[PDB]
Structure 1
């Protein structure tokens, strides 16, 4: 059935969705991120990072303390279930991951880890 979603992160620090549905018949799921804004990665970079709700805060915080040089993700962070590269104005990045990494019932969160962005740039992802 459908196993993909397009998402945009813009100059206004927002994702154009705050809730993603993964159909449990999907084996793989694709996120196609784009940056339709005009500002550079060092001041308006966006990634789409997926973790459990419970892990989000640690991923965000440890990612913040890693610099831009590391795409604002802590090296070797196993809490990261899937993620795109960090992108700036005009860039795109797509990420496909295994649905076997999700479970029904649980609330996953997707978010951007650029410093601060996650106060606005976050949403839920649910398998059903």
Structure 2
């Protein structure tokens, strides 16, 4: 359906390196759970959807934003959507209308928390 629950552990990993969104889906909700137990201040995670080769740039700019801005430059136009930053035991969710993903282009989801995007990076695609 229009649901997805992605996990994040103290080992800096996502329990999914690819999420598919059905074309039937109007808007899409993506829930994030931090299964680890380290405080957000040390191993917090978030999910940021953006153009695949426009990811590096957002994480770098997000790093400068600070934890107060969930490590995402306020109003960055390159972000399709992004959850808040959660810590161990916490959970969050983001809902974005699928009508945003462009044709032909590739989209990857990742964590912008300083240094995590290198491994906590995945690819989110549409229908088929």
TM-score (norm 2): 0.94
Mapping 1:15-30, distance limit 5 Å: 15-30=14-29
- 2:24 & 2:106 partners in 1: Cα distance? 18
Deviates more, 1:17-26 or 1:67-76: 67-76
Contact 1:71–1:85 (CA<8 Å) still a contact in 2? yes
1:55 aligns with 2:54: yes
Q: Which runs of 4+ in 1 moved over 4 A?
A: none
Query: In the TM superposition, what is the alpha-carbon distance from 1:57 to its structure 2 partner?
Result: 1.1
Distance in 1 between residues matched to 2:84 and 2:114, nearest whole Å: 15
Q: Deviations over 1:55-110 (max 9, x none)?
A: 21111110012222221111221111111100001111011110100134321010
SS at the partner of 1:26?
Answer: coil
CA distance in 1, matches of 2:72, 2:85: 9
Which residue number in structure 2 is paired with residue 89 of structure 1?
88
How many aligned positions are there? 127
Which residue does 2:66 correspond to in 1? Answer: 67
- Superposition RMSD on alpha carbons, in Å? 1.0
Shift of 1:54: 2.4
Tell me, what secondary structure is at the counterpart of 1:61? helix
Distance 1:103 1:66 in 2: 26
1:103 and 1:127 in contact (8 A); partners too: no
